[PDB]
Design an enzyme around this catalytic site. Structure first.
Site, PDB file in Angstrom:
ATOM      1  N   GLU A 181      36.182  44.387  37.155  1.00 28.25           N
ATOM      2  CA  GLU A 181      36.804  43.377  36.333  1.00 28.25           C
ATOM      3  C   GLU A 181      36.403  41.937  36.494  1.00 28.25           C
ATOM      4  O   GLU A 181      36.339  41.205  35.499  1.00 28.25           O
ATOM      5  CB  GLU A 181      38.314  43.509  36.458  1.00 28.25           C
TER       6      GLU A 181
ATOM      7  N   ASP B 113      37.441  39.377  25.814  1.00 26.60           N
ATOM      8  CA  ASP B 113      36.639  40.360  26.463  1.00 26.60           C
ATOM      9  C   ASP B 113      35.507  40.729  25.546  1.00 26.60           C
ATOM     10  O   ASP B 113      34.989  39.918  24.743  1.00 26.60           O
ATOM     11  CB  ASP B 113      37.470  41.650  26.688  1.00 26.60           C
TER      12      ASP B 113
END
Length: 162
Positions: free
Chosen positions: A11, A20
């Site tokens: 992550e 994202d």
């Protein structure tokens, strides 16, 4: 090595909002703020979660804080999932970790779409599962992570992560 060390590697950190992959407002350690496209609510969201006016800028302590809740939030959906649980219980420590990562990544819902792949995990067809799993959008969206996760499920080891 463990789930925590894992996701952290998959992550990455971030103290300022980000879109994202498919651009949802995310922050910290792959912490999703909002599905919408408003920098707005994300900030809104962001703030309710931190219990303060971030103005879009958290510190570590916080990002990690969310993180620990998230990981924790994922084990439950799993557990609270009539279709995930069963696979989960059937698997071992390392392997469970991969499942969690998936879920952490796409949701109870999203993961549960791996009908066949889920069936081969619980049947233990590691090999068939890897292949299957890799032939997906997920893989195509996040080839790297996706690969680390597949190998793990497959080897049952942490090797992909060192």
């Amino acid at each position: 090595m463990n789930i925590f060390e894992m996701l952290r590697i998959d992550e990455g950190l971030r103290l300022k909002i980000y879109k994202d992959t498919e651009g949802y407002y995310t922050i910290g350690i792959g912490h999703l703020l909002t599905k919408s496209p408003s920098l707005n609510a994300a900030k809104s969201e962001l703030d309710k979660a931190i219990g303060r006016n971030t103005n879009g800028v958290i510190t570590k302590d916080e990002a990690e804080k969310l993180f620990n809740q998230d990981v924790d939030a994922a084990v439950r959906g799993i557990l609270r999932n009539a279709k995930l649980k069963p696979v989960y219980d059937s698997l071992d420590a390392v392997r469970r970790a991969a499942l969690i990562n998936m879920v952490f990544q796409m949701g109870e819902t999203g993961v549960a779409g791996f009908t066949n792949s889920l069936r081969m995990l619980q049947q233990k067809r590691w090999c068939e599962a890897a292949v299957n799993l890799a032939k997906s959008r997920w893989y195509n969206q996040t080839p790297n992570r996706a690969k680390r996760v597949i190998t793990t499920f497959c080897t049952g080891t942490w090797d992909a992560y060192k």
